[PDB]
Amino acid sequence: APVDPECTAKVGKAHVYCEGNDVYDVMLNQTNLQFNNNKYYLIQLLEDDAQRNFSVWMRWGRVGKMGQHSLVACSGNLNKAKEIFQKKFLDKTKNNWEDREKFEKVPGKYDML
């Protein structure tokens, strides 16, 4: 569970946030040669080590290409950050994150693991 090296603003100073089982780091894929999809979507909830301060990192593109990315800062509001992460996970897969163990792929939606 290393912080995405592409997140230059945090690779030195922060960790992926966890609570036992629940490690808020995940990689998504949708390959579909009918529509020429071969694309990823990474999501990471990050806490700083120095201060109690949270961020959500998202990064996406065609497999192989460094794509685009977003870093959303939450300043200690862990709930904001879990919401963003979980909402986005749902948006892209049509599965709830808490329901991760029993993941059911959907047509035209991202796949996990």
Task: Enumerate binding residues for a second copy (CB under 8 A).
Answer: 8-9, 71, 73
**Contact call for residue 96 and DNA (CB under 7 A):** no
Piece of the chain touching DNA by CB under 7 A; list 14-22, 49-57, 75-83, 88-96: 88-96
**Contact call for residue 66 and DNA (CB under 7 A):** yes
Is there a contact between 80 and 55 (Cβ–Cβ < 8 Å)? no
**Contact call for residue 29 and DNA (CB under 7 A):** no
Of residues 42, 45, 58, 81, which one binds DNA by CB under 7 A?
A: 58
DSSP structure string for 46-111: EEESSSS-EEEEEEEEETTS--EEEEEE-TT-HHHHHHHHHHHHHHHHSS-STT-TT----TTS-B
**Contact call for residue 21 and DNA (CB under 7 A):** no
Shortest CA distance to 3 belongs to which of 39, 41, 43?
A: 43
Of residues 27, 67, 78, 100, which one binds DNA by CB under 7 A?
A: 67
- In the list a second copy, DNA, none, the entry touching 73 (Cβ below 5 to 8 angstroms by class) is a second copy
How far apart CA 24 and CA 70 sit, in angstroms, is 16
Query: Nearer Cβ to DNA, position 62 or 105?
Result: 62
**Contact call for residue 103 and DNA (CB under 7 A):** no
Tell me the sheet residues that pair with 16: 46
